[PDB]
Amino acid sequence: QSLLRIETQLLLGRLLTRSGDQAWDFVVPFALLVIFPGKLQVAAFYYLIVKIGTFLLTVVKWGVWLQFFAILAGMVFFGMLDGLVRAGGRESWLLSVLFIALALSGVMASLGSQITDISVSLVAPEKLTHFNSWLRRIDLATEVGAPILAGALFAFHPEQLPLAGLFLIGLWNLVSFVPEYFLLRNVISFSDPIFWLILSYALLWLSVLSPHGVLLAAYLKDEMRLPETEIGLFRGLGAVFGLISTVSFPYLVRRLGLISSSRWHLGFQGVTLGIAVTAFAMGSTASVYVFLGCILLSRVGLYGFSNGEFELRQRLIPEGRRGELNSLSSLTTTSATLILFSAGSLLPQTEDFKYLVYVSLAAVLLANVVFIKWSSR
Ligand SMILES: O=C(O)CN(CCN(CC(=O)O)CC(=O)O)CC(=O)O
Ligand SMILES: [Ca+2]
Ligand code: NI
C-alpha cells in the first residue's frame, strides 16, 4: 500500500495538470461576462463551439504542449478581446475573428486536458487497486481546491483590472508546464425496454442546476452578483455532497432494492431541486442561499441515481448488446448538452436564464417519472 517512484510521478502529474486545467476553465465564463456584461448568451456560444469542435476532433505527448499553446493563445486573445470591446466600436469583423480564435483555443485547451488524462500499463496489476483508489483523492482535491482558489484569484483583483486574476491563472498554467512536462516525460434502440432507463439518465444532462455548470457560474456572477470566491465555494461543496452519495447509496442498496435506492435518490434530487426553484422565484435576500443550498443537497440524489443507472445497465444488458447501447448512452448525453448549450446560446439576455432553470426542473421531474414507470417491469 505504498506509492512507487514512478507511480508517484504519475499522481503528481495528474495533480498539477488538472489543477491548472480546472482553475482556468472555472474563470473563463467569468471573464467572458466581464467582457460582455449582460450577455450570458455569448459565454454559452463560446462553449457551444468548444463542445462541438472537441467532439469533432476526438499522441499522448502532445497534451502539455496543447494546453500550453492554448492557455498562451487564450491570454493574448482575451487581452485583445478586452481592449477592443472597451474601445466602443462594436460588432467589427475584427471582434468576430478574435472571439472565434479564442473559441478555437478552447477546443485546443480541452483536447490537451483529455490527452493528458490518458497518460494518467505502468502500475503493477496488483498495485493498481491501491493506485486507482488514490487518484480519486487527487481528483477530489482539485475539484474542491481549484474552484475555491481560482475564485479567490479572480475576485480579489486590483481596482481597474477585473481580468487581473485570469492572467494569474494562465501564468500559473504556463509556469506549471515546466514541472508537468518533466514529470510526464520521465514516466510515459427501436424496441428495447432498457432504452428508457438510458433516457431517464440522459434527461438529467439538460439541467443547468449544477455546481460544476458553467451556465450557472455566469448567471451567479452577472445577474445575482455572487463573488467568484463564493461561486467557487459553491462548486467545491457540490463535489463534497456527491461524496455523501457514496455512503447513502450502498446503504439503501442493502436495506432496499437497487431499484429503490436509485428511485429514492433520483426522487430526492427532484424534491430538493423543486424546493430550490421556488426560492429562486422568492425574495432574493436569503433565498439565493437556499437556492444554492438545495442544489448541493440534490447532488446526493443525482450521483446516487447515476451509480444505480450504471449498475442497472451492468446487470441488465448482455455483453453482446453492450457496446451498442453505450453508443446510445453517449449519444443521448451528448445531444442533451448540445441542446443545453444551443438553447442557452439563443438567450436574448442574461436575465432570462430563469427560463432555463424551469426546463431543468421539468427535466429532473420528468426523468423521475420515466424511471418510476420503467422500474415497473
Ligand atoms: O453542468 C454542466 O456544465 C454540464 N454537465 C452536466 C451533466 N452532468 C449532470 C449534472 O451535473 O446535472 C453530468 C454529471 O456530472 O453527472 C455535463 C458534465 O458534467 O460533463
Ligand atoms: Ca496547464
Ligand atoms: Ni454536470
Tell me: is residue 186 an annotated ligand-binding position. Answer: no
Set of cell numbers at residue 88 = 466602443
- Amino acid letter for position 208: V
User: Which atom of ligand 1 is found nearest the CA of 209?
Assistant: 12
The most distant pair of C-alpha atoms in the chain lies apart, rounded to whole Å, by 65
Residues 44/340, Cβ–Cβ less than 8 Å = no
Instruction: Please state, in angstroms and rounded to a whole number, the distance separating the CA atoms of residues 300 and 241.
Output: 6
Instruction: Please state, in angstroms and rounded to a whole number, the distance separating the CA atoms of residues 260 and 276.
Output: 24
225: left (phi over 0), alpha (psi -120 to 50) or beta: left
Residue nearest atom 11 in ligand 1 by C-alpha distance: 210
The CA-to-CA distance between both ends of the chain, in Å, stands at 44
Instruction: Please state, in angstroms and rounded to a whole number, the distance separating the CA atoms of residues 108 and 292.
Output: 32
Tell me: is residue 139 an annotated ligand-binding position. Answer: no
Question: What Rg, from alpha-carbon coordinates, does the chain have?
Answer: 21
Instruction: Please state, in angstroms and rounded to a whole number, the distance separating the CA atoms of residues 246 and 242.
Output: 7
Residues 32/46, Cβ–Cβ less than 8 Å = yes
The number of CA neighbours under 13 Å toward the Cβ of 23 is 29
* Long-range residue pairs from 291-295, CB within 8 A, at least 24 positions apart, any chain: 292/234, 295/209, 295/210, 295/211, 295/234, 295/238
User: Which atom of ligand 1 is found nearest the CA of 47?
Assistant: 3
**Which residues fall within 8 angstroms of residue 222, CB to CB, at 6 or more apart?**
33, 37, 38, 40, 350
Residue 352: which domain range? Answer: 4-377
Tell me: is residue 180 an annotated ligand-binding position. Answer: yes
Residues 331/167, Cβ–Cβ less than 8 Å = no
- Measured in angstroms, the resolution is 3.2
The number of CA neighbours under 13 Å toward the Cβ of 218 is 34
Instruction: Please state, in angstroms and rounded to a whole number, the distance separating the CA atoms of residues 326 and 338.
Output: 18
| Number of domains comprising the chain | 1
Ligand 3 centre and the CA of 161: distance in Å?
31
- What's the gap between Cα 249 and its chain centre? 22
